[PDB]
Amino acid sequence: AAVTQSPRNKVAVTGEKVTLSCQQTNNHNNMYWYRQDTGHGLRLIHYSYGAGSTEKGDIPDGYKASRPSQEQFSLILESATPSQTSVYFCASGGGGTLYFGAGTRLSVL
């Protein structure tokens, strides 16, 4: 279990702060948080090169991120919105190679 996503299913309320953790067991430097949408393949919301670091990806609006340790990299919705209702994937990266987790569906009522 190279990447662990929690909770795999979440039901939030509009305008509520929401946090979706990710644990990696290989200690890779880089971690990524995407969100899967039909026709959208997988877009990158925020990534990180290390404990402390956190970088905007292609669609970072509405979200924050946090690298407390080498293992944990989390995504945060400051104020959840119906628009943010999707399925979320984080990966950990070794180099030119990615390792994904099982995924996290979120509903924002």
Partner: protein
């Protein structure tokens, strides 16, 4: 004695398009602290490594501190000291497996003699000017007669992240920011509180300013933070 700077001297956060959470990370309840320690090892000429194990999470058991030049590191190599500074992990290297490791600059003060006798801590006043009008003052506290500028700098910005949202994840309320120390002897130096322009922030490099291991007589040194805003 570096002279007060002017607008074309200072960083504009609006010129920064990266993640200000990377600035924030370094001054939001974030610091390596250790009381009474001796160098255990070494990597380059100008560095010193300690066994300081991560207080909060479990992110490091060894701490490398880089100083300005070799003799500076020898100065302290075999001294029972006190550590305290802002630490970073991206681009922190030091081949001594199992990492469990962090880096920082300067931040080393001699142990014995340097503490205030009984309980008692020394309170240092910080005046904050926002667009010139001194709109708030406060004090940071230490326990060393001779405290690194670093140390009071970190506490100052930590208080301000909180009380004035000095730093945020995305940006900052202020366009400019710098923190001036003025010493009894009349000496003064100021640090830019903002990251260089661009869509990236090098944490290793920003902190490198603490190389000098500059120290200041807590009891009499003063502190001025000058903050500027634009759009209001």
């Amino acid at each position: 004695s570096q002279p007060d700077p002017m607008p074309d001297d200072l960083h504009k956060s609006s010129e920064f398009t990266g993640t200000m959470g990377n600035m924030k990370y370094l001054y939001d309840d974030h610091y390596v602290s250790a009381t009474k320690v001796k160098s255990v090892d070494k990597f380059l000429a100008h560095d010193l490594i300690y066994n300081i194990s991560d207080k909060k999470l479990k992110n490091y058991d060894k701490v490398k501190t880089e100083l300005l030049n070799e003799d500076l590191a020898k100065k302290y190599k075999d001294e029972v000291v006190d550590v305290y500074g802002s630490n970073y992990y991206v681009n922190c290297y030091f081949s001594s497996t199992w990492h469990g490791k962090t880096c920082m600059y300067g931040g080393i003060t001699k142990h014995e003699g340097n503490h205030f006798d009984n309980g008692n801590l020394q309170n240092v006043l910080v005046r904050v000017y926002e667009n010139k009008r001194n709109t708030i003052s406060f004090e940071v506290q230490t326990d060393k007669k001779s405290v690194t500028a670093q140390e009071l700098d970190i506490k100052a910005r930590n208080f301000l992240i909180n009380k004035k949202n000095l730093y945020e994840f995305n940006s900052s309320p202020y366009e400019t920011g710098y923190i001036k120390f003025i010493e009894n002897n009349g000496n003064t130096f100021w640090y830019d509180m903002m990251p260089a322009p661009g869509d990236k922030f090098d944490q290793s490099k920003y902190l490198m300013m603490y190389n000098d291991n500059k120290t200041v007589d807590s009891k009499s040194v003063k502190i001025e933070v000058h903050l500027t805003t634009k759009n209001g």
